[PDB]
């Protein structure tokens, strides 16, 4: 009772290429309710250095909400215990052209200011011996997304994970997103978006394949 | 009085390629009024198991409605006695460029949860000896769509059937659809959509042809 | 350990007004895991009646997948043990103008055929003593959405629930949806949508208020 | 050297009506740099509790960026030392019809999870003796937005602030926004948005005026 | 075995108001296979009078196709044996606000030249004792649309029939359509469209109600 | 006094290639006014067979209106006496790059049911010795459009006609249309459209030219 | 053999209110081929004062084309011999709400520089004793449009004419157009449009009616 | 005092390639005012032949406005005394990639009926030694547009003019426009538009370049 | 205390290729507040020659505001003391496909009239050893945009400045803007816009790469 075959495989692959999120061993076995109260403790401190009145009916519970959100939600992707269960049917249909999943909702956080990243992901792969459940791609994407991230690392992690679970390197990933740490503060650019793409296999090597995919990416609604 | 030339041709061609829908032999001759009532009875139990009050004037008729929807409507594609009448005219116009029928309405069911799939298909072929009635393409698409499906299989069936009927390997099919078992539940993604395509003859081999078709696909209204 | 103050209040308000979903008392404490298998059992029988090979690597978990989806997901709103938690701060800001939450995502199922209803809700209220957490409105809407519904009933239920929890009659609800049993089968209308609305108090009696709300409805993205 | 007339006046006003952001007296004069280093202090603790390797070159400066962002940017409207410089020309043009500034860019933070709030503001007023510079309206709006807010309060603050600095009650404010703690977490609604409006003077009392303003609000690009 | 309660009710109500379609008594019992072949024969002559070569494999089947289209399809609305089965449930939800079904697909024929009319209908009613099945509205619209028409008459028939069936004068119908005998020939106007509406009960008398309905009409996709 | 040089050239080119509309020689000089009445006669019989009261002030001119429309309007392209006049200036500007006339309005009729075809054409050619009047392209397209057509044939005819009149094989034609016999009846698909294309000379042999043209097609307004 | 009942009626009505285009008696009976050669004569002169070389293959025929265009086309509305034939059916359907014809194509000329006016017309009337053929409104509109015009006079003429032919003053006309003499020369404004509206009867007097109509006008595609 | 280097150079170029607008030597020095009064002279004759009452206050100044418009505006590019002043900075920036000015407003007149031509131009060039001011490109384009044109010639004139004034053959020009003598008269096509492109240098010869330019052309707003 | 490493490196590189903004040696150390004041006077001077009454309570502050604006804001990119702080991280993610930043807000000024330039920039590069923080690119762009500019140069500057800080020639830049000196004065073209692009490394020599990036450019919102 710890990890799953797939979860293990992916994690190994990610460290092997040295693409895992920069983590440290958990040292000693610390409860999650402990981590959460500890984290609310610090949030109470920060909130006081801001001069907010924690006595307020609305503010009082924020430290604890921020604590559950960090551990249970927006960063749950740092604990492989949360990896999604994977299901794969055999490729009896003999699909040999690419399958594409466009405009996958994707919300993450910039590791640089812990601010929101709103974006869309398009993922395509060429089935080999197995066909993956379609929702699973959405879930694998949201998983890596729930981690403090840098867009370039995010795009690459997804490629590797899917590559690992599908059994081919013929996978491609493109992400188009908006960083609120560029929009809401700093340079305050309200109109820019960033686009990153990772291409494995034929998607990288074969010019014709490379463009059918790039030609398909970017489907604004 | 059973099946038709075309219906049987198509059916064989699918079984030959290992692409038919996972079916079992109807064992003993079961009349549809009988399948419908038996089915109706199970839905009656399922609704009771859900604590619904079948004594209500709105819910009362639901088991018979669901059973009829299953047998005559949404899954009627599993019975080749429903295959559409095909009509082919002689290619006296000597067309030798592709004919594309785009944005064909496509409603179907995900075989993993029996939930609505809503999408659109784009089909193209290059006439050899015969030109098919346009409406017939739409019809063929709906027939295979009225079956519990997996988008990747559904796509190939439309292809193989068309090739078979048209006497050419020069056919291409593309489907862009939304799966409600991805949107309405589970990961609950309100924006992703899946695109799958299958190309035959020149649409596969000729890079020229292939990209002309792909280029034309995706005509959002 | 059974029900929560909010939940019980809501369920009673609805019963008193005769707007609860038609439900028959459980009878005996039948365990949920028992219900799922009985349901999954009947689904198996239904699928064998359609002649599908349940021995297929893709159709085997289906009966089980449906059972779990029905009981745990799309019909979870039938069990008040799933009523969302309510958080209400006091109206110190002295807000006396309607707050409007629009384009709330809403996926439901029709009770006449158990087919997908995909729509959008717009809720509005004039806070009296308390202001509610914004997401709770969303959560309340989805709770009632996960039930075999009739759009007319669904709209009323959301009104009563909200009127009850906020201690006011000044609430308004409008739902704009697409029913697949109209779209995907039957008459097969691919463009019609249905709009229903429930107006309480001022939204109903005051011409001025009523139109301010209706004017602000139907925000297609 | 502390505060300016404008700010003290606005500040008093909000406090008088019980609409100031819940703040605690600083207590003792803590140097903003200490504050930041303390905040960055606690954030480091938190990042360690999430098991992130702060030894990494990318995560290394994060606690310090967050600290600086919090105090100097996203929450800078908590200190009136930051209130914008107001300019008021004489209303010689004898303007007696509303002036409406629409689609003011507004990015704030919800106070329940400190997550991004992205929206637009529409402000109108009827000039009495003074006529404020246009951009000031933009600056005042963004001032109160740089605080842990609640849309209902933020709307009121803006109204009160402008009525005060303008000399009239004839001011209207409407904000329309997306709360990411609703969109990127929890219920995860990708489509809803919230609209709040605060009406003063003729905008509240005069129906003709009230609807002239409501009619114009909501200019999506 | 002839007509149905509702079919006859509706039919009478139209004749009573002098709104039925200009029909004559079927004289002697003429079987539809007979009407179809007789019709087919005239189209055969008309096509010959046009110098078309019925020996061609594409034109050969046209007379039988046109006759069937006329009798079973596009004009099948002239025979009440085709009226749709109506289903009404008890208004236990006590709805007392209008229900609007908007953008119903409507294809019809101009009676002046037997040319396609393509448009959309918006229908609304306020339930008294009963709520009708939504799909039934669409169906009723198509029934009266499958008749040689004049938009102004077609609009009223839908109204009167609905009033009759729903036991209320509180119904409203609006149709926006394109006439191909205006677009495809004659003046040849590629952009005009005609809107016609008929209001009953409160939708006529109450200015309040009337404008709420009109306000909601015209939902271009 | 019978036919014009252009007309005769065109009619012959089409006959030689076997692409003329299937026509049977008149036989005897039957006067057009005689044809119209015989046609109007049969239409009368057809309408009486549908049970319509031809004595109605609105249905009385119909048989006569149809006859005139068929012979004089929508099928006028069957009589080369209606071929448009051609004006060709010499190519002094030495134009050697394709001229493209796009979104040419095209309304036609299907030959399988005589129902409206509403579409758009895009024509392109590389002038050799002569440049044609722009409107003539339009006029040529509508000439062939006014004939019971099959889109595949229609496209070829326009190519041949233009190739013939301009003395070049460097012409290209693409037609994008909606067939009401698909939309308004039968399968009743409300979203599919059909695209056909005919490429001559360089447009067919030169990869470079072919794509420049296809790339420039499908200009939805 | 000169004029038609309707044509006369309208012309009288127009002079009676003194709204006719400023014409003069034709003095003496001058042939139309004479007027046209005379007019080409002057056009040849103008063209020479511009230094164009009329010897050119393209220019040579312009004087005559401009001459036919003026007399036979763009100004044919100055000769009531061209008025359209009107057909009116009796209002047996008892329509008593307004009928509307939107986005009627309308091309005219400014009397001030004989340059193009591109626009759209919306016309509505409330049937009284008779219902007019729908295409007839389009034709009456294009008729007055084919005259040197000033937009305000144009709008009024149409009102009167329809008022005269329908037998009620309850008619309304709105025109939205673009004047190329404002766009292509002079101030050269590329974005403005002008809108004129004439309201007769209840459309002018009754506030409620006045706005249902104004609320409907302006349907950009 | 007659012409400038720029103009004489352009002029010679067009004449050398046989692309100048067909002009006749002025012959004798006629004073532009006489010309205008002569032109206004003939236009008065024409308006009298159309039976318009020139005694009217609105039609009174028309012949004089037309005369002035013709000579001083819409046809002013016929006199090179009107050629724009060209400015050329030194290409120090060493720009070696194309510069593309898109959607240049272009309003011209067709030379067959002197009717409005409204369109857009897209121009690109690859700087060699000189780099022209941006607006000049706009001015040169509008210079040749102010002439009775033929789109095919107008496109060529612009190309030649710019190649000459720039020092390179690397210039591309594409115009897309609506001819009103096609839209407002004759065939009356409300939707078609014509596209003409002229390619020089690498734009003609280099496929890579050619398609980079064609790819970017056609930016509808 | 003068300039930073980066700043220096960029500035040199520009001078080296001779693409620096034409600057003269400051000569003697003149304080800014002194420059601002000297400029202010010269404004008061100009505003007096325009005849504007500087005594007005609203025109008063202008020379001082224009004063601040030129030096402190819109031309601040002239002083490298303002170059933004650059932050790079290790490319441990092994990113080797391009990273694209689109629709970057760009507000410049033309150097020919000091008039507003309003565009959008798209920047891309293929990471080598370091990966720049996203927000930085935006900052670099606004820096060079804060200078009296000529589009063709601005594009070039942004390119070199980036190739220098990233250590790769593999950078690409595209700018699409509207020059108000072309729109609001002079030729007054309200619709044209200009596009300039600079390609380094593979973006210039690799056909494939070159087109991947050009295919991405131009993301209108
Ligand atoms: Cl930053
Ligand atoms: Cl799942
Ligand atoms: Cl039904
Ligand atoms: Cl929550
Ligand atoms: Cl007509
Ligand atoms: Cl069919
Ligand atoms: Cl003027
Ligand atoms: Cl013509
Ligand atoms: Cl200039
Ligand atoms: Zn960041
Ligand atoms: Zn599923
Ligand atoms: Zn249903
Ligand atoms: Zn929150
Ligand atoms: Zn008609
Ligand atoms: Zn057909
Ligand atoms: Zn004018
Ligand atoms: Zn012309
Ligand atoms: Zn400038």
Curated annotation (Swiss-Prot), chains A, B, C, D, E, F, G, H, I:
Domain of life, per lineage: Bacteria
SUPFAM superfamilies named among the record's database cross-references: Tetrahydrobiopterin biosynthesis enzymes-like
Kinase in keyword set: no
Any one GO cellular component localisation term in the record: cytosol
Catalytic activity: GTP + H2O = 7,8-dihydroneopterin 3'-triphosphate + formate + H(+)
Database matches in InterPro entries: GTP-CH-I_C/QueF, GTP-CH-I_N, GTP_CycHdrlase_I, GTP_CycHdrlase_I_CS, GTP_CycHdrlase_I_dom
Keywords: Allosteric enzyme, GTP-binding, Hydrolase, Metal-binding, Nucleotide-binding, One-carbon metabolism, Zinc
Known pathway: Cofactor biosynthesis; 7,8-dihydroneopterin triphosphate biosynthesis; 7,8-dihydroneopterin triphosphate from GTP: step 1/1
Residues at which Zn(2+) binds: 110, 113, 181
Keyword Metal-binding: yes
Family that this chain belongs to: Belongs to the GTP cyclohydrolase I family.
PANTHER family, per database record: GTP CYCLOHYDROLASE 1 (PTHR11109:SF7), GTP CYCLOHYDROLASE I (PTHR11109)
UniProt xrefs under NCBIfam families: folE, PRK09347.1-1, PRK09347.1-3
Record protein name field: GTP cyclohydrolase 1
Phylogenetic lineage: Bacteria, Pseudomonadati, Pseudomonadota, Gammaproteobacteria, Enterobacterales
């Amino acid at each position: 009772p710890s990890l799953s075959k797939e979860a293990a495989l992916v994690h190994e692959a990610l460290v092997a290429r040295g693409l895992e999120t920069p983590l440290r061993p958990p040292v000693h076995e610390m409860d999650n309710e402990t981590r959460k109260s500890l984290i609310a403790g610090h949030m109470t401190e920060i909130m006081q250095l801001l001069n907010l009145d924690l006595a307020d009916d609305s503010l009082m519970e924020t430290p604890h909400r921020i604590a559950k959100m960090y551990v249970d939600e927006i960063f749950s992707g740092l604990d492989y215990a949360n990896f999604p269960k994977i299901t794969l049917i055999e490729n009896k249909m003999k699909v040999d052209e690419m399958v594409t999943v466009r405009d996958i909702t994707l919300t993450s956080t910039c590791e640089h200011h812990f601010v929101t990243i709103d974006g869309k992901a398009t993922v395509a792969y060429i089935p080999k011996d197995s066909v993956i459940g379609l929702s699973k791609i959405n879930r694998i994407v949201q998983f890596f997304a729930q981690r403090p991230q840098v867009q370039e690392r995010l795009t690459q992690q997804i490629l590797i994970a899917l590559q690992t679970l599908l059994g081919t390197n013929n996978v491609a990933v493109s992400i188009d997103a908006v960083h609120y740490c560029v929009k809401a503060r700093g340079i305050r650019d309200a109109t820019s978006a960033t686009t990153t793409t990772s291409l494995g296999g034929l998607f990288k090597s074969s010019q014709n394949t490379r463009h059918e995919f790039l030609r398909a990416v970017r489907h604004h609604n």
